[PDB]
Protein: ABC transporter binding protein AcbH
Amino acid sequence: GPITFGSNYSDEAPKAAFASLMQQATTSTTVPVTVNTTDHNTFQNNISNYLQGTPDSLATWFAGYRLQFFAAQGLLTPIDDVWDKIGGTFNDAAKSLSKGLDGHYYLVPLYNYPWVVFYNKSVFQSKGYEVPASWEAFIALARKMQSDGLVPLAFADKDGWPALGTFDILNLRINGYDYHIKLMKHEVPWTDPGVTKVFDQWRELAAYQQKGANGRTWQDAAKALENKQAGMMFQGSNQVAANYSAKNLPDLDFFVFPAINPQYGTDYMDAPTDGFILPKKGKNAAAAKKVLQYIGTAEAEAAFLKTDHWDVGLANGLIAPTYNDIQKKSVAEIGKCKSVSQFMKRDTVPDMANAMIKLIQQFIDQPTPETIATVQKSAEDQAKTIFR
Structure:
């Protein structure tokens, strides 16, 4: 009764960790597992074709638009039964990100990481900066940083994807989670005034973001933070904290993006969550489900994450013996969100995210009301052809 497992874990470290994880899954469930690895990028690029052909018993995937898309199409087996067994291990956000539009479960999540505002502890302590809970305080602090002669927010967007996070967090803070997701699915148009508010808020924020961002790699901005030339930096932990030297890492901390509209407080965050799915056309489903139940445990998460320094498991209360302090706080802060988004690139279709990358670079170049009008119009026209 062996199963096969389609895996996009092609880099050396995660490949080794996943292979180890499956040895433990066989040990626990008795189900032998053959891991079929495909180049990471290729795997995804071929996801649709892979699912409709002769897919493995189980596969690596992640939460977001495509998960729900493949589920609505009938390409994935629902795993409500798996969830009857593991559900007590996971909170409400973990549960939501694992369901299709039809309320059934299709994913078993394993880990995520956070998009939050990074700063140097020693700097805040010496200059007398207090962690800001609200937009008001956040702006006041940014203003104080400027007077103090410090770039408040290291910022970069030559990579194209980094600025999408700022769009996401402004939307989540101002319009909420349900609206952001609607926008991503194009159930709300890009010309909606909720979107105008986001860019309007950004116009204010942009006064405090590092200049020349369109020509800067995120590593160079992260290095400005590390070199104490910038007070803060908003991005994913596996990016900023990963870029820090071991020597400086102990000075690194973060807080969640401040509250703007108290109706949404800080209830939401981009925390891209990877997991596993059960391809309908896959074989040996009973056995597959047994492995998925093992995967849905704190033990599975801690085992897979041994050598992973940034990602954290979603199982309730899990603080793995190998976690660093950034990881530990990540667990606490992610665990406090009612719902977790998946970053723009996973929450909408790639064409759309890709269209937003350029339009956001354009806003960043000229953050004015006229550019906003142009951006909204261009985004909506793109969406009309993309979601037809």
Observations:
- The longest strand covers residues 230-236.
- The CA atoms of residues 3 and 387 lie 36 Å apart.
